[PDB]
Structure formats: C-alpha cells, structure tokens
Amino acid sequence: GPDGMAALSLPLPISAGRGYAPAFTLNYNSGAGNSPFGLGWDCNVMTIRRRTHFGVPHYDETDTFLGPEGEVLVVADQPRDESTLQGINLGATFTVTGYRSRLESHFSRLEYWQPKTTGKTDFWLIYSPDGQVHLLGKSPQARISNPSQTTQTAQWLLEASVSSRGEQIYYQYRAEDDTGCEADEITHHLQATAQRYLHIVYYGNRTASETLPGLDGSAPS
Amino acid sequence: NNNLAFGAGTDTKTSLQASVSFADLKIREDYPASLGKIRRIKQISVTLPALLGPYQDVQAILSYGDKAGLANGCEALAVSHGMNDSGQFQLDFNDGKFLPFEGIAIDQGTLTLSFPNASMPEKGKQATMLKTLNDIILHIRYTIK
Amino acid sequence: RDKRALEVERTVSLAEVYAGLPKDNGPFSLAQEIDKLVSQGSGSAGSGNNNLAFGAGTDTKTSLQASVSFADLKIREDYPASLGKIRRIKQISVTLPALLGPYQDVQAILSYGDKAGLANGCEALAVSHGMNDSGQFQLDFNDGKFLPFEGIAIDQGTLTLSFPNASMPEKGKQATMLKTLNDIILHIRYTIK
Amino acid sequence: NNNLAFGAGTDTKTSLQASVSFADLKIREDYPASLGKIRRIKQISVTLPALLGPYQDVQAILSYGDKAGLANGCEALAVSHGMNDSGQFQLDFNDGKFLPFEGIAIDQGTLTLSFPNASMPEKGKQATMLKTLNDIILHIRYTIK
Amino acid sequence: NNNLAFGAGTDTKTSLQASVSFADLKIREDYPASLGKIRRIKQISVTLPALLGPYQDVQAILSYGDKAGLANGCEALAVSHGMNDSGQFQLDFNDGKFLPFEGIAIDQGTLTLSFPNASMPEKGKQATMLKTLNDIILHIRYTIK
Amino acid sequence: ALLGPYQDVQAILSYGDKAGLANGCEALAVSHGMNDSGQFQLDFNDGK
Amino acid sequence: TWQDNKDVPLTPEDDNSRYWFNRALKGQLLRSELYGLDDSTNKHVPYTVTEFRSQVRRLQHTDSRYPVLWSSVVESRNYHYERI
Amino acid sequence: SAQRLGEIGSDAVTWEKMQPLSVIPSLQSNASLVDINGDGQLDWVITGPGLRGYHSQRPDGSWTRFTPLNALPVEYTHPRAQLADLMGAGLSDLVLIGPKSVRLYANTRDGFAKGKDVVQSGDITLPVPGADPRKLVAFSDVLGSGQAHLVEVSATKVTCWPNLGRGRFGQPITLPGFSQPATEFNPAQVYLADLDGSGPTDLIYVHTNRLDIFLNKSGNGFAEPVTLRFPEGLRFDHTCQLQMADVQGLGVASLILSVPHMSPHHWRCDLTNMKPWLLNEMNNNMGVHHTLRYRSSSQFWLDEKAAALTTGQTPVCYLPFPIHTLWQTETEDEIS
C-alpha cells in the first residue's frame, strides 16, 4: 500500500456467530509499538479516544476526540437532553451531542453522552449504517482513565453492541492487577490499575433484544 | 508599601505601579549580625518573565521613593528588555560613578516599578504585555561591611 | 548639573511606521513598495517626511532611500513627563532582515538630513551588514568622542536610509537584496534627563 | 579541623558549618619542592553541587579561620550562586587590590564554610535546600614562587 | 633531545618527562627567509587531550633548558586544565611583563614537559591520568622580525 | 574549511607599494585562516 | 459542496479551504499502469492503463477548524493497449 | 549534500563537494537553526534587541522572508532555559527547571503561550540541569514512550521522572544496571541514543579505546554493557566528538567518532546492518517460506536524486525524515 508498511493478518478462529459476531483479527504492522500482543502486533479492538497527536489532552471541554477509525471527530449537531436509552433508565439526565468524522468514509453517527447530573459517568454510542449500535466506555473496566482522578477518561473501550435482528454482544475487560509482578515492578509505578485488557466476549443470545446488552451496566451471566 | 496601584501623578494615571518595602523583604536576616552592621545596595537589576511581540519593548521605570541624598539620577533605573537589564547600555562596576540605588540600606524605604501605558481601555501598550507577566524579579546586589 | 540619565532602548519598525501613516498621508506596505520601486526606478511612496524615493542628486539617482520623521514616531509618548523633559539620542543601530547571496554585503547610509550643531561626521552612519549594525567597527560608549547621532532630540528631525545601487533598470547590485528585504529596523538608544 | 558542626556563636546556632584544614589537603605534594618552596593562594572560588532553581540563591560564607596580616576583608568570601563563585560581583585578577585569601600559604590554617539559617527544626531558610547539596567543591588558584 | 625519561632530580624521579628540540621541529623552514631572520617565540600554550573526571585536574610543568637568557620565571609554565593552557590565570598580551618563553629563538634549544607523581608503582596521580593522554600538543605563537 | 582545529596555514598577504607604510605594515601573517589578522589580538582602539 | 442537496462544483475560496480539500484526497490511487518487462518492441507500452478522478464534497464547515469533507472517486478509465 | 555513492544499486551514501549556499539569511549573529513549527522546515531563529523572528528553509532551498512571530518569552534567552517537549505535542517548548517547579511556555507554533508556573505533586523533586557536575541531567525517551522524560545519570544509577505533560512530572523511578567507578565517572562521556531503534534510548559510556553500551530494557533498567573496542590506533579524548546518525539509511543510527588532533579522522561503528525487531521471516511448515527486506525512504530519495542527475529533474524532497519502508520480499516453495 501507499506508505510502504509491512503487514500480516492472522484471523482468530471464531467460528460461531449468528450473522453477527465479535470477529477479530490479529495483525502485524511494521512500525507499530509494543502492544498486549507483543511488539508489532495487535487486534485494535474498537475504541473512542482523545487525540494525543498534540500532546497530553485536556479533560475539560476544549478537547479533541478521534472516532473508532482513528480520525478527528467534529461536533456535528447541537446538544439535547435525555434520561433514557432505548427505553432503559440511565438513572440521570445526560446531555447528548452528535459527532461526525472530519473525513467521511462510512456515514455512521457518533454520540457523546455527558451526564448533566454530577456523579454519573459519560459514554459514547456509534450508530452504524448497518443498523447497529455500539456502546463504548460505559462502565469501569471498559474505561481508560487516570487512576488518581478516574473521571478523566482518555479512552472508551467497546463494551456492548447490538444488531437490528436481535443478536447482541458484550465485551468484558479485565484491568491490570498487580499480582505476582515483583516488588520494584510494583513499587516504582504504583499506578493503581491503569490499562485494560479484553478478557472475554459474550455472544449468542438466549433472548433477543434490540437494546444494548450492557443494559444499565449489569454484568452478564 | 506592598501594593499595586495606578499612579496619582498628573501623567501617571494610566501607569501601573507595584511598590515593595525593603524592610519587609527581610534581607538583613539572611546573614548573622556578626558579619557586619552595614548592609547596603550596590546595584539592582530587573527581570520580567513575560511575552513580547516582534518589535515590542519593555517600557518601565524602577525608582526609589525617598530622596535620601543619592546623587541625582541614581534614584531610578529604566528597563528595556526585562532580562536582568540593569541601568546601563554598557554596564561597568568600575564606571567611577555611583550606580543606581548604590548606598541604599537593604533595611528601608519603598521601591516602585512603574509601567506607563498599562491601563487597557485607555489604549495602553504595556497593557497587552502585562497580561502575560508572571512575576517581577529583582536581582539585588548588596554588600556587607 | 550632571545626572545619571535613564537609558532606554527603543525598537522601531519602519514597516509599522509606513503601514500606520494617517490615511491622508498615504500609508503603505514597506515590503511591497520597495519591490515596485526597485523593479521600476525613479518612483516614490508615502508623503512628507515619511516616504520612499530615489535620491535627487545625480550622485544619488540610483540610490533608493527611506525616510522617517521623529515627530511621527512619537517615541516621546512612551514615557511620562515627570521623568524629565530632555530626551536625546545617544546611539542608533540598524538591522536589515534580507536574504543574501553567498558573500554579499549590505551597503547603506543612515543620515540625519537636519544637520545642525552636531559634531562633524556624527550626522551619518554606515551599514555593512545589519545585525544591530553601527557606524563604527567597534562600538564603545566610553569612546571619549560623540557617537553618531548623539545629542539629537527624539522629538524632531528626519532620518534617511540610502541604498546606493538599488535601481533595477540600472542593474544596481543591491536591487535583488532590496526586493528580498522585508523591513527596516532601527534600534534607538536614547536617554531621559 | 575536618568536621561539620553547628556554630557556637550567639547568632550562629542555626548556621551549619563545615571545616577543612589546608594542611590535610596535601596541596604541597602536587609539585616537586625544587620547583619553589613558597606556595601561596591567589584566589578561591566556590562551587556548590546543589539543586538551586533559576531564581534560587544559596547563602554562605567562606572564611579563613586564622589570622595573618591580611588586608581587611580578605579573610572572607560570600557565596551566592554556587558556580565558581568569587567574592566579587566582577572578578578581576588585575583589580589592583588584594583578592580574598590572597597570600595565604597553601598548607596553613583552615577554611570554614558557613550556611546560616540551616537548622531544620528552627525552620531555617536553607534547611531544605541543603538536602540537595551533594558535595562542596573548592577551586583554588595558587602560585608557586 | 627528543625523548621520554624520568627526571633525575631528587624530587623528580617519579616525574615523567617529555622533551623536544626546536632545531628538529624546523619551524623556521615553514616560511621564506625574505621575511626576516629573527624568529622568536612569543607565547606557548599546552593542550593535553585526555579523559579526566569532573573534578580532576592535570598537573604538569613546561620548561626551557637554557634559562640563563630569560627574565626570572619565564623559564617555565604550569599546565593545570589541559584544554589550552597559557598557564597564567589571565592572559594579556598587553600585560606589560614578558611572557613565559618569550624571546626564545624558534631555531634552537630544548623544551620539556614534566608530570610529577607519574610513576604508578609509587602511587602517583598522573600515573593514571596519563594512561588516557593521546598526544601532547603545543601551540607556539612566534613572531617574525 | 581549509584547516582543521589543529592545522595551520602559512601564508603572507602583502601590499605592492610598501614605500608609503610604516615598517611591517606592508604585510600580514595569515595562520589561523578563519577571518584572522596580522596580529594575535586585533584592537582598533590601540595606539598603533 | 452539498447545497440544496446538489453536488455543486466548488472553487476553494482561500488557501485554508484549499488545504483541507487537498488533504481529503490523500491515499487515493490516481493512476495505475500494468507494464510488461521483456526484450520485445512492446516493452515500451503498457498492457493496461487505469486512470482515476477524485472529488471532495464539502458537507459542513460550522467548525471552522475541521470543515467536514467526503471524498471518493467520481470517475475512472481503463485503457486496454495490450502493449500496442 | 548527501548523494548515493556510485550507480543506483550501490548502497553506500556519500556527500558531494561542499558548495557555498546560494542564499543565506542575513542576521546570522544571534540565531540558531531549529524547527520551531514542526513543519519539517528548519527555522533560522533570530533573537536579540527586538528582531524576534525567523527564516524558514523550503525544500527547494528557498528561504522565506523574515517572519516576526507574535510572542517570544523574555526568558527565551535566559542562561538556563531549555528547549524540551513538556506538552507532548512534539513542537519543543521553552522551559526553566527548578527542584520543585518549572516555568513552561508552550509552543503555539507562531510564538509561545503565556508561561505558567507548574508546581510538582507531593514531594517530587526534579533534577536541575547543570546542578551537579558529576551527574547528567537531560531529557530523553528512556522509557520508550515517545514523550521524552527527565533523566538523571549518576555513576551508580539512572533516575527518571516521567513526563506527564504541561510541565508536570511523575515521581522518580529507578532504572538500575548502569554503573561506573564514581571518581572517574564524568557525564561528559555519557551519551544517550536509541541505537536499538525500538524506542527507549541506550546509554553509551565512552572510554579511551572502548565503548560501553548499556542497553535499555524498555524502561526497566539496563543490560550489562556491551563493550566495543576501537580499532588499533584509534583513541578518544575530551577534544573528540561522538556523532550519531543513520547516515547509511539502515534505519539504525551509527556511531561516528570524530577525532581532530593534527589530522581529522572519522570512524563509523555500525552495530547492525538491519533495523531490529522488524519481521524478517515467516514459515508455515507446509512448505512456504517468506522473507522480507527493508530500506530507508531516504535511500529511495537518493535514487530519485540520482535519476534526476543527468536528466536535470531537480528531485525536491517533500519527505523530511527517513521513514523506514518494506523494499523486497521473497516467497519460496520448499517442495518444488
């Protein structure tokens, strides 16, 4: 391709699905850094994130975010308030604003839900052209935020998604936990749980729904 | 004597002044009494950690209030760049003449730094510079006898 | 009667002076007018004592010069009256932000066209390169003699900066330098007594 | 003569002092005796390897803890920046007057470096600064006759 | 006159000496005779490229054999920095006194350089510093009359 | 860029009509090669 | 520009506008030639030539820093020479 | 200027005989060459009695007219001011460092932002550049994060304070494994570089006749040093320099020892002929073997230049740095 990079794709053996599935591929990208899959390899599980291209981002309002493809999100529309999602009580009023990528290529719509009520957390929703809704960073575990000030969310990891035909998927992350790591390894960092890993993805619903599987943040059985 | 104000002089009304008391600086206290009782200023320089435009100059006057008997002109110093400028285009400790503020006791009197054309709505100039000024730093050279 | 004077260094942009002339005096872009005047010689820009022109004497017809009056610079208004009424120039330096060929020099003369009681030779300064230049190979404020322009009141009089071989039609060697030059900066060191 | 202590004088109780003898420095052994038996100090500068910020001063006095027919004031040097500090704002070997410590034999007497307001429990000004002082360096200029 | 050896003096047998003949350098030949016959040394500086620690000095003496024709003290120069030592703390061509080695013909005589405390078996200091000395470079300023 | 840091150039610059000059002012010793002059220390404020 | 729901021809009104319009085309293939490598007299001609024309549609510029553009290929050609 | 040495296909890189530049900006006396915009075009930046501003150099060698800037800090010319990235933006900001706080003027590209005083958290005490001659205080990406951290190198350990942005630093952390005799240790001999090439910088300690290279274990301390020896006749001293650059376009900088003395000499120590950690090979155990080869974009530019020579097609380069690319691959059937 155009930049001369070397690359490889190694799909994961996910045979199950119902026409919708959390299908991921492990990919080699020369020039890429050290990831959870080693140096040069990753799966790039979808996330919404602050742009760091211009340095440590603000956690304020004059912030820039990237869409899931890694492109600049421009506020698309004006904010409105809403207390429910797909009929589910969110427990508070949120102000929601739509975003659109600077360089269009997919025509999805992205929403940012910023709690109006102090004490609740925010979230992002992707409305895909295929009629799918993807929820990122709703609950702790799916969030990358400053351990010292956890409200400063840097990244929103995909937590839940639903297709139009009733199949839905839930993504469970396991946070970094300092067990068996060596005393200096823990002592000189004391990060208090930063970084999240995808641990398990739940799919194949016993019961159909058009709602997001994360519901109100409850864990799956 | 530790304050800010716009000056009351006829032509100082848009000039922003910052005054400080030498007594309140507690410099004498820095060294034991046994080192000598006479502690006086030999030279003062000024540093202004602000931003400047391409042809912008600092325009400010530092002066000692009391006409304590210093030779005429040693009561004040002009600042142009704000980088430890001192009082001369060419600085010389061996000039043969007394330097600005030379002979003033570290113990007393009020020193003031004046910035003319500081008021904003009056269409000032230092008025813009000053918005970026984080401090006023003095470098005081004094001697102990 | 002597006193220690307040020593003040004033940066002056001629581009600001010309761009900022009163509408009735013909404000202009300094870089833009120089380019036009060099490409086509014997023109002019501005008015009064704040302008660009080619010199009138035969000896100077290929010389492009810029001039500014102290009255219009209004340096005096920078400081309050209470600091003293006599404000006079001690030394003037010159900077020219042009690009040069590999071993090219910059020739220019800065002069006071209002020569009066000023000691002989102090009415003018030569420029060889810019960079806060000086009419002396070595500048010493303890020289013992008067420095160029010393004693001129900051309130009045006209300075002119002449470039000897500026006219492009005459194939002047400085013509490309001048087209290249963005501004003229003076550094006026003056004191308040 | 090779020690640290807080000073015993009335106004030195909070002053931390260091003392080093000259004789124990073995300066004399650096060069053959036949090169000159008269070896005397011309100038001493002081360097303090400490984390002093850009506007942070160090306050210390270096003095000769002995007596000789020294010019008055040549018994001591003030330290302010800690970077080869001299006892003059402008160091000049050709000043015409004697420098601090000039003419002191290289192996006689002792030097003491004092740091006023050092005791931590007394909330001394230099009490926290000194926690970053990792060494004391002297730069001795001396000549051989 | 172009060799290494230890000094033979009573306090020099641990001192490593270097030497050179001016006659063998033949500096004279570098310029035509039409410029004049009198070619004499004005000043010599010494460079000792080496790897020393942050507080580690080098100690060596540069000296001229036929001292009889010189003003007292012009027969030798001390080297302590090693970068480019002129020896004298303040180099001044307008000093008013003669410089070390000044007036020596570039045509003849032996110049030497000693390093005291160089013998490692005697636990010297130059003894280890010298292991990193890659060359000895002299900078000879001379004039043609 | 002719010489490195420890290299010298031997060259003499001289004026043809030497007759009007004070002795030695007819020539300059080039040796450093980097905007040098005929004297170790150039000073225009000197008396010579 | 997308005006009154039409794909209206545009001339960038300034250079910042132009910048974003040029940026939007990055990575787009403009031309692709298939050229045989041999010692025949036809070694000087491609078998095929593919040409593309891209475009950028301006959709929204209320945020003056990032004026939301959509780019794609509006038209393309494919010449078949067979090295003739 | 760099040029390919010999025909296209000859990898060695050389330089053409020096030529005076056709155009040089005036006002060279109080200025330096720094990219202050992140443009790729270096800016000749002028400071002094006003005249704040610069001339940028374009890819065709054309210099711009003087650009005045709109905000230079007074402290820009302060004796201890550093140029360092404390925003994380990659522009290089202006900063003064004290033990408890820093004064940071963010780079806004057209000038600097209002400086701010940043007080460090807790009792984190920062190293102060130049504070102790026995230690090296410098910014370097010792953790391999791409941000540049503040690192202090002593004879016994390396201490690092992570860059958290806006002049804020993390707590010091220890990076063990570095050691030299304390008396002889001299920061002047300590150089930092990513010779490995994966990010975290390595520590090179220079000795007469040898180089000790402590490899950086991705911010977890150092590997026992690799001692490289100099070729016989090659020595090193305080007048000698160490340069570091990927002069051959291999993706890895080489170490160049520059020796002045009475006749200049330059020696290049290549540590590897290829950038490490790139995938070189793949094999499926079914008979298909793959292999890769990589080259700097800068070598390809030199070929573009070589093609331009003879033809006169001035090869203006719009790609200022050596992005490393995939050049050649092979696939082999082990069965047929």
Look at phi and psi of residue D121 and say left if phi exceeds 0, alpha if psi is from -120 to 50, else beta: alpha
For residue B26, what is the nearest residue in chain D, using CA coordinates?
D125
Closest of A153, A141, A156 to residue A110, by C-alpha: A156
Cα–Cα dist H5/H22, whole Å = 24
Per DSSP, H88 falls in state S
Determine whether the interchain pair D11/B33 forms a contact, defined as Cβ–Cβ distance below 8 Å: yes
Determine whether the interchain pair C137/F45 forms a contact, defined as Cβ–Cβ distance below 8 Å: no
Cα–Cα dist D83/D52, whole Å = 11
Determine whether the interchain pair F27/E42 forms a contact, defined as Cβ–Cβ distance below 8 Å: no
In G7-24, which positions are buried (b, 16+ CB within 10 angstroms) versus exposed (e)? eeeeeeeeeeeeebbeeb
Backbone angles phi, psi at F34, to 5 degrees: -125, 75
CA distances in angstroms from D69 to A188, D72, D110, D140, listed in the order given: 58, 9, 16, 20
Determine whether the interchain pair E89/D33 forms a contact, defined as Cβ–Cβ distance below 8 Å: no
Neighbours of chain A (3+ CB pairs under 8 A): G, H
Query: A-chain residues within 8 Å CB-CB of H323?
Result: 3-4, 31
Neighbours of chain B (3+ CB pairs under 8 A): C, D, H
Q: Return the structure tokens found at D82.
A: 């800690």
F23 shares contact with chain E (CB less than 8 Å): no
Query: F-chain residues within 8 Å CB-CB of C138?
Result: 44-45
In this structure, are residues A68 and A48 in contact, taking their beta carbons and an 8 Å threshold?
A: yes
Determine whether the interchain pair A56/H282 forms a contact, defined as Cβ–Cβ distance below 8 Å: no
Q: Which residue has the tokens 């200022």?
A: H320
E143 shares contact with chain D (CB less than 8 Å): no
For residue F45, what is the nearest residue in chain C, using CA coordinates?
C138
In this structure, are residues C114 and C122 in contact, taking their beta carbons and an 8 Å threshold?
A: no
| Positive or negative: CA dihedral G62, G65, G70, G73 | positive
Closest of H50, H112, H33 to residue C183, by C-alpha: H50
Q: Return the structure tokens found at A82.
A: 């809403």
Per DSSP, H332 falls in state E
Cα–Cα dist H125/H123, whole Å = 6
For residue H77, what is the nearest residue in chain B, using CA coordinates?
B83
Cα–Cα dist C73/B10, whole Å = 23
Q: Return the structure tokens found at H109.
A: 């590209």
Determine whether the interchain pair F4/H18 forms a contact, defined as Cβ–Cβ distance below 8 Å: no
HSE, CB side, 13 Å, CA atoms: give it for residue H255. Answer: 26
Closest of E12, E26, E102 to residue E60, by C-alpha: E12
Partnered with residue G6 across adjacent β-strands are G3
What is the CA angle C159-C164-C165, rounded to 5?
140
Neighbours of chain D (3+ CB pairs under 8 A): B, E, H
In A121-152, which positions are buried (b, 16+ CB within 10 angstroms) versus exposed (e)? bbbbbbebeeebbbbbbbbebbbbbeeeeeeb
Cα–Cα dist D57/D55, whole Å = 7
Cα–Cα dist C88/F5, whole Å = 47
Torsion angle defined by CA atoms of residues C30, C32, C33 and C38, in that order, rounded to the nearest 10 degrees: 120
H89 shares contact with chain A (CB less than 8 Å): yes
In this structure, are residues H36 and H92 in contact, taking their beta carbons and an 8 Å threshold?
A: yes
Distance from CA of H221 to the nearest CA of D (A): 24
Closest of A95, A72, A71 to residue A82, by C-alpha: A95
Q: Which experiment gave this structure?
A: cryo-EM
Query: H-chain residues within 8 Å CB-CB of E137?
Result: 261-262
C137 shares contact with chain F (CB less than 8 Å): yes
In this structure, are residues H94 and H104 in contact, taking their beta carbons and an 8 Å threshold?
A: yes
Partnered with residue A7 across adjacent β-strands are A29
Torsion angle defined by CA atoms of residues A53, A59, A65 and A69, in that order, rounded to the nearest 10 degrees: 80
Neighbours of chain F (3+ CB pairs under 8 A): C, E, H
Distance from CA of C106 to the nearest CA of F (A): 18
Report how far Cα E143 is from the mean position of its chain's Cα atoms: 18
Cα–Cα dist E40/E142, whole Å = 5
Determine whether the interchain pair B137/D12 forms a contact, defined as Cβ–Cβ distance below 8 Å: no
Distance from CA of H102 to the nearest CA of A (A): 17
Which of H78, H97, H132 is opposite residue D49, by nearest beta carbon? Answer: H132
For residue F24, what is the nearest residue in chain E, using CA coordinates?
E145
Closest of D26, D27, D9 to residue D17, by C-alpha: D9
Query: E-chain residues within 8 Å CB-CB of H207?
Result: 51
Cα–Cα dist A113/A97, whole Å = 7
B4 shares contact with chain D (CB less than 8 Å): no
Closest of B135, H175, B91, H252 to residue D54, by C-alpha: B135
In this structure, are residues E14 and E121 in contact, taking their beta carbons and an 8 Å threshold?
A: no
Please report, in angstroms and rounded to a whole number, the separation of the first and last CA atoms in chain C: 11
F10 shares contact with chain E (CB less than 8 Å): yes
Distance from CA of H186 to the nearest CA of E (A): 5
Amino acid type, E101: F
Which of A28, A39, A185 is opposite residue H198, by nearest beta carbon? Answer: A39
Largest CA distance in chain F: 37
In this structure, are residues F30 and F13 in contact, taking their beta carbons and an 8 Å threshold?
A: yes
Q: Which of residues 9-38 of C touch H (CB under 8 A)?
A: 9, 11, 31
Helix, strand, coil shares of chain E, percent, nearest 5, are 15, 30, 55
Look at phi and psi of residue F47 and say left if phi exceeds 0, alpha if psi is from -120 to 50, else beta: alpha
CA distances in angstroms from B38 to B96, B106, D60, D80, H269, listed in the order given: 22, 9, 18, 18, 63
For residue H135, what is the nearest residue in chain E, using CA coordinates?
E54
Torsion angle defined by CA atoms of residues D68, D73, D74 and D77, in that order, rounded to the nearest 10 degrees: 130
Backbone angles phi, psi at H226, to 5 degrees: -90, 125
Sheet holding C158-163, edge to edge: C44-47, C50-54, C64-69, C158-163, C108-112, C124-127
In this structure, are residues A73 and A111 in contact, taking their beta carbons and an 8 Å threshold?
A: no
| Positive or negative: CA dihedral D90, D91, D96, D101 | positive
Q: Which residue has the tokens 């001379």?
A: E142
Determine whether the interchain pair H131/D135 forms a contact, defined as Cβ–Cβ distance below 8 Å: no
Q: Which of residues 58-117 of C touch B (CB under 8 A)?
A: 78-83, 90-91
Partnered with residue H34 across adjacent β-strands are H43
Query: H-chain residues within 8 Å CB-CB of B134?
Result: 103, 114-117
HSE, CB side, 13 Å, CA atoms: give it for residue A11. Answer: 5
Question: From the CB of residue H166, how many other CB atoms can be counted at a distance below 10 Å?
Answer: 17
Backbone angles phi, psi at D122, to 5 degrees: -100, 5
Cited resolution, angstroms:
3.7
F42 shares contact with chain E (CB less than 8 Å): no
Distance from CA of H55 to the nearest CA of D (A): 30
Determine whether the interchain pair E35/F41 forms a contact, defined as Cβ–Cβ distance below 8 Å: no
Per DSSP, A79 falls in state -
Q: Which of E25, E48, E51 to mutate to test the interface with H (most CBs of H within 10 A)?
A: E51
Q: Please report the DSSP string for chain C in residue order.
A: ---PPEEEEEEEEHHHHHHTS-GGG----HHHHHHHHHHS-S-EEEETTEEEEE-SSGGGTT-EEEEEEHHHH-GGGGS-GGG-S-EEEEEEEEE---EE-TT----EEEEETT--SSPTTTTEEEESS-SSB-SSSS--TTSSSPPTTTT-BTTS-EEEEEETT--GGGT-TTHHHHHH----EEEEEEEE-
E15 shares contact with chain D (CB less than 8 Å): yes
Which of H99, H103, H133 is opposite residue D132, by nearest beta carbon? Answer: H99
The CB-based long-range contact list for A176-185 (8 Å cut-off, 24+ gap) reads A184/H174, A185/H220
Partnered with residue D61 across adjacent β-strands are D78, D114
Closest of E56, E59, E121 to residue D29, by C-alpha: E59
Q: Please report the DSSP string for E15-41 in residue order.
A: -EEEEEEHHHHTGGGGS-GGG-S-EEE
CA distances in angstroms from H153 to A155, G38, H95, H187, listed in the order given: 34, 61, 20, 8
Determine whether the interchain pair E137/H262 forms a contact, defined as Cβ–Cβ distance below 8 Å: yes
Cα–Cα dist D25/D106, whole Å = 9
Q: Which residue has the tokens 């010292």?
A: A148
Determine whether the interchain pair H165/A33 forms a contact, defined as Cβ–Cβ distance below 8 Å: no
Q: Return the structure tokens found at E96.
A: 């008013």
Q: Please report the DSSP string for H166-181 in residue order.
A: TTEE---EEE------
Burial class (CB in 10 A: 0-12, 13-18, 19+), C125: buried
